[PDB]
Amino acid sequence: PSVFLFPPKPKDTLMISRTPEVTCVVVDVSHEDPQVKFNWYVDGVQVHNAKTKPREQQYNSTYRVVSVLTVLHQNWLDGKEYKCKVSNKALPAPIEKTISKAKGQPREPQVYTLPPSREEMTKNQVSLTCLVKGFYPSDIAVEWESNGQPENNYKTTPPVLDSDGSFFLYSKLTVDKSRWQQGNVFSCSVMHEALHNHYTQKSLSL
C-alpha cells in the first residue's frame, strides 16, 4: 500500500477567512487490513485532535483511507513541517511523509494590467489581461472583480519559470464588448505571500 501527502491550496493559506488543510491519502488499502492509524505531528510535537478527520472509500478492489489536518495559516507560511504517520497491521513498520512550503527568499510580484487589442474590438467579447510577473515562490492566486462584484468568465495560466529565477503568470478575464466600452472598471486582484498585506488589486478601465 502507499501514503501520499498534500499541501493546502494557495488561496486557503493566503486568505485569513479560509482554511488551510494538509491532506494525507492512503492507497492500495485491501479488505482484510483497513485499520490505518493516523499520526500527525506539527514541526515535531504531535497534534492529536488537531482536527484530524478520516473516512472509508471503497473501490478498485482496495480501500482508500484519508485523514486531513487543518493547518495554521502563519505556520505553513513560516515553513513549518507537516507529518503524516500511517500505520496498520498489513505493514512491517510506520511510514512517514513530511511536507513543507517551498523554500527561497520570496520575491514580491509585480501586477500590471493591459486592455484589449485595438484589433480584438471588432468582435463581440474582448479580453482583459492581467500580468503578474517576477515572483516566487510559484504559489499564488488571482481573481477578478468589477464594481465590488466578482466576474467569473476568466482563466489563469499556471505559473511559468522566468529567466531571472522569478515566476510569471497571465490571467485573462472576458466581457461582452459593451461593458468594456460602457466604461466599466475591471479589477484584477492578486494574492500573494510576498505582497504587503498578502494582497493587491490593480484596476483597469477604458
Binding site: 486568505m15 485569513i16 465590488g148 504587503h196 498585506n197 498578502h198 494582497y199 488589486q201
Partner: protein, 56 residues
C-alpha cells in the same frame, strides 16, 4: 452580512464596517482599505464576532 475591521497598526488605531456577501469578500474589502492606508500586518477573523484584526 456586515463585517467589521480592527486596525491595531502603528500610529493608526481604529475600526470600520462593510456590507458584504461572504466573509472572504470582506477580507478583500478591508484588506484593500488596509493598503490604502499603509497598514501592514497579520490578520485574523472570529465568526463568533464576524470580525477582522490587523496587527502591525
Amino acid at each position: 452580512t456586515t463585517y467589521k475591521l480592527v486596525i491595531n497598526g502603528k500610529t493608526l488605531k481604529g475600526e470600520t464596517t462593510t456590507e458584504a456577501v461572504d466573509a472572504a469578500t470582506a477580507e478583500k474589502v478591508f484588506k484593500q482599505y488596509a493598503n490604502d492606508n499603509g497598514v501592514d500586518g497579520e490578520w485574523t477573523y472570529d465568526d463568533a464576532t464576524k470580525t477582522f484584526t490587523v496587527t502591525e
